[PDB]
Structure 1
């Protein structure tokens, strides 16, 4: 099921992590590698990335 929760969360994490503007290059690459290594962790990885993005907003 290409549209089940697992797969939608994986695709969405790739797409949304690619968008997050306040990740640096190394951090972004680490998230992508983590997604590839364990797609079951996609929603958790996205949540982690979004928090980090907000922590690293210009101030």
Structure 2
């Protein structure tokens, strides 16, 4: 538990989300590295993107 909870959760959940493409995942991970304070914003963004990309 040395990591910030929101940081670790964003990494795990962005890896877990099934409807992100690979480029989107990699972009979220680079953004997390760029600015870890943005972890909760980035997770919320990734979840909205995931839900917008469910197969029809």
Shorter-normalised TM-score: what interval?
over 0.9
Task: Give the aligned length.
Answer: 56
Distance in 1, Cα, partners of 2:3 & 2:31:
15
Flag the 1:5–1:49 CA change in 2: closer, same or farther, 3 A.
farther
| Rg comparison, structure with higher value | 1
Structure 1 unaligned blocks of 5 or more: none
The TM-score normalised by the length of structure 1 is: 0.89
Q: Provide the C-alpha distance between the structure 1 equivalents of 2:11 and 2:18, rounded to a whole number of angstroms.
A: 14
